[PDB]
Amino acid sequence: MNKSQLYPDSPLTDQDFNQLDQTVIEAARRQLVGRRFIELYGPLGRGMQSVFNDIFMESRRVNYTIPMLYKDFVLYWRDLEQSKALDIPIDFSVAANAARDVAFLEDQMIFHGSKEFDIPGLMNVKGRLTHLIGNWYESGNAFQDIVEARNKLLEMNHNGPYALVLSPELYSLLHRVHKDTNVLEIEHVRELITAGVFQSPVLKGKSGVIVNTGRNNLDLAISEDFETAYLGEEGMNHPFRVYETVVLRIKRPAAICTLIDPE
Amino acid sequence: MNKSQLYPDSPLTDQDFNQLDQTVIEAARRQLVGRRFIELYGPLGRGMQSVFNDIFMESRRVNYTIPMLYKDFVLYWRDLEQSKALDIPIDFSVAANAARDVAFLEDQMIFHGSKEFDIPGLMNVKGRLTHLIGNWYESGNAFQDIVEARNKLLEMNHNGPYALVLSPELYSLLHRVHKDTNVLEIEHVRELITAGVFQSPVLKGKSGVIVNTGRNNLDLAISEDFETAYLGEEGMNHPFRVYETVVLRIKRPAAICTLIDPE
Amino acid sequence: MNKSQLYPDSPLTDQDFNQLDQTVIEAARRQLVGRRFIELYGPLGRGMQSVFNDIFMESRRVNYTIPMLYKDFVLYWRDLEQSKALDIPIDFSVAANAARDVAFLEDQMIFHGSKEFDIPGLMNVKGRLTHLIGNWYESGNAFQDIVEARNKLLEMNHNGPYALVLSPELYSLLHRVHKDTNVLEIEHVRELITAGVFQSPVLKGKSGVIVNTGRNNLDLAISEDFETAYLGEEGMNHPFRVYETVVLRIKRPAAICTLIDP
Amino acid sequence: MNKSQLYPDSPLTDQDFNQLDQTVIEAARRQLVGRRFIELYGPLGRGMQSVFNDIFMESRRVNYTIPMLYKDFVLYWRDLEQSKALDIPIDFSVAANAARDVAFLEDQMIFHGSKEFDIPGLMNVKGRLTHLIGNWYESGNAFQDIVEARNKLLEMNHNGPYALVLSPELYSLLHRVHKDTNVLEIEHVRELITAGVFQSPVLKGKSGVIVNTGRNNLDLAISEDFETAYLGEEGMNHPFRVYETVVLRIKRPAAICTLIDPE
């Protein structure tokens, strides 16, 4: 399936359109936090507009509608025509920005869920464990809270490997320089969490989540990965659409222990 | 030996059945702690239902019956039929869970032995050294206990390399952040134990074990590795069986110094 | 394409499966009432485990999971061997009982919905029109209450053809003679409702429904019709299963008028 | 385009001229700080003497004239003639010095802009965030100032990855050895800034800048990379010119949070 012949009126050729995909894929890759520890359920394809989920509580089956996440960018015709005249590889700076916004949309949908499509997220799924953090500003408390949260996961027949995602404010507190001591608390934490410790701008305030990275616990249902579309001429310009269809499936919500600030 | 023709009625083809083995093998690999420091005695094959062991005490020979460790999972026919209709690579999420449970079964059999089959484990073999740990919550005690346990192994003509396996509670105490100091006690410990320091959920409470990793000291007798079986149609579904036949052989029990909490 | 190769371990030959299929299908046809006035959207195939419904209320898209309705019957090996030895056709009576039960399940799901998957029925869908009927024992009331119900559908921009399904008690009451015309009320109703007046045991008491026939109004989305699948042989006996996967989509809820006893 | 036939009177042959480019390219590479975290807008070529910039403020378009940055060096004819007589690969020590000066010129133009050509730099662009640092000589203040500067970038929909460039005086203070503690403050800082922490001699006094490394935020418009030219015989010698044409484009100035000493 060549995308040049799919959009016969597209101003981009085969070479020009592949670089657009590379710009979109790379820009999204740098910002996707959920994909770093959640496996993909393959390219389900255009023939699947809804995927099934088997929730196990420690086996209810539910239907999830795969949602669209998209953002549009416009490539000016004057800039495009100049590029072909001079034979230069075209500027896709806006495409990277559009791909980043879609990548942020996926992370927001992964961690907080689709309210309108009724899809639970990591931080609000039903049946997950909950741990109340202490004052992470103090030494040892952050590691102690992770251990207690990990202990809650352990008493569920969930031996790991775990992945911990924290808000930027909690992430900074983990790496902060203490006064009395000189302990890098991420070094102690990263030994217990082997799948990786990440920060996500989606999480707000003081919040975090520990997830078992097994494919059996949760995965990402992908009907169409990050793809670039042509919307046709509009005002002589060339608006495009970076879209993706993905729904998070949480088969075993008990493998999630969200850390929440007691306020 | 192609597994598609071995089960002529199996719904999975050659390609579909290989991905099942990959899912089972990888999921087991992530959870097998004993295999990380215990060598395998090859594929003994189906012709050996019992393996001999020569115990040396510092040469009694005993017969060990190779036990079966298995767990069953069911692939729904509706999900399978949909996968072939859409030509998608089939979901083996349950297979990973079944393989993980078998992997946990092997680790429980390796460390605690088969009570019914009369096979000693690492933590209850006859003739091994025993060390009583102190308060690992204090700085330096955990390293001191390992040194004393290692010294006991040294005064047996057992120069290493050693492997230390600890319970999750002891593993956390090793990596904990101390108040007065900022010592990462795993860094001091990991220098003496070169074959690796692992944690196993099988060990409960405050317990651990130091094992010489030599093939002459102990090994794993494998008659059949992690293999996936088809049990035939049952209620129009497709139940499978992830089974493995393995017995731990401890040729020199004196190469084991189990750490036990004095309670 | 014969079921003998589909189930090599089955004890039935090509002809025996064929006789099994007619036994199941014929018993289903004699009991299926909803299929008489509702078009069939399919067979979609095994690749459709859930269908999409676009509700045009008088637009909202709802995802419906296709339910699987089944019933199990067992053929005894001694009976099959005895019939085979004596050159007597196999007795598939239990198959008809299983097929009849599944046919009732489909009719029950069509009319009263399926609470397990939250699929609405003819008498349960939101947005339908409700008509409070009177005492049909008295003359003239039976025909008039249908006229007002049809007028309700006419006011909602639905001009037929209509299909009327009544409870078995109410269907008999429609056989009375008209007070003035001296003609049975059923022929007056049949001229107003040209898609047929049916009866169904699923409706109890004074109940009924008027449905505007048409694919754009409502249809049956099936992925597999009445099919007999041979389960594994257990205990030397042969258990079977008559199953089907059907879901009812009501695209225009306002095209359904329900007669409700006050 | 062979450079030997481009300058028919050049004393260097094809082999002799390629080593000149390698000396210039490598010497420039060791000193270019801006190129370590700013992407290039390809070889725009000689047909583009001015490049367009679309400034987004959180979309004004401006025209930037691509400037020339060059430095001249002289290869003595006596040294050149001796090299060919003995068949030795010629000394290009001066060429490395000339390339280094041009590389310093680019970094000065990237961080402080072209005053005469009216091109804003990283440290004086219009619409960028500004943070006032504290006493970096004290422990924790340097990390705290980076976090606050990063927090300012975060409240602009700028999630990273960030690149921090500091003056040599600030760079030394970051790596300094404290009295009361033994904290290496670069280790804490380098976790938040993933694209890298660099020092630039261009920045004077106590100054720094945090830049989002996205191609959409800023990039380097290159009309001609580091190229070596022959200026013809002058006094029987061979003067050359190491020139490059490059202009920095800041599409989103809000992605820049310059750290400035309150004096």
Curated annotation (Swiss-Prot), chain C:
Record's description of how this protein is used: The encapsulin and cargo pair can be overexpressed in E.coli and in human HEK293T cells. In HEK293T in the presence of 0.5 M ferrous ammonium sulfate nanocompartments can be detected and used as cell markers. Can also be targeted to cell membranes by addition of a farnesylation signal to its C-terminus. Coexpression of this nanocompartment with a smaller nanocompartment from M.xanthus (AC Q1D6H4) allows of expression of different sized iron-rich particles. The encapsulin shell proteins do not seem to mix.
Its biological purpose: Shell component of a type 1 encapsulin nanocompartment. Assembles into proteinaceous icosahedral shells 42-43 nm in diameter with an iron- and phosphorus-rich core (1Fe:1.1P) which can store over 23,000-35,000 iron atoms (with a calculated maximum of 83,000 Fe). There are 2 types of negatively charged open pores in the cryo-electron structure; a 3-fold pore where 3 hexamers meet with a minimal size of 7.2 Angstroms and a 5-fold pore where pentamers meet with a minimal size of 2.3 Angstroms. The 2-fold pore seen in other encapsulin nanocompartments is closed.
Domain of life: Bacteria
Marked site positions, 3-fold pore central residue: 9, 233-234
Name of the featured protein: Type 1 encapsulin shell protein
Source organism per UniProt: Bacillus thermotolerans (Quasibacillus thermotolerans)
InterPro entries: ENCAP, Encapsulin_nc
Family listed: Belongs to the encapsulin family. Family 1 subfamily.
Cellular compartments annotated: Encapsulin nanocompartment
This protein's domain notes: Formed of E- and discontuous A- and P-loops. A-loops form the main pores while A- and E-loops are the most flexible parts. E- and P-loops of neighboring monomers arrange head-to-tail and form a chainmail topology.
Gene Ontology BP terms: intracellular iron ion homeostasis; iron ion transport
Subunit composition and interactions: Initially thought to form a 180 subunit shell. Forms hollow shells composed of 240 subunits, making a shell about 42-43 nm in diameter. The monomer is capable of assuming 4 different conformations which allows packaging into the icosahedron. The shell has 12 pentameric and 30 hexameric capsomers which form the vertices and faces of the icosahedral nanocompartment.
Site features described as 5-fold pore central residue, chain residue numbers: 182
SUPFAM superfamilies: Major capsid protein gp5
Any one Pfam family match given in the protein's UniProt record, by short name: Linocin_M18
Keyword list, A-Z: Encapsulin nanocompartment, Ion transport, Iron, Iron storage, Iron transport, Transport
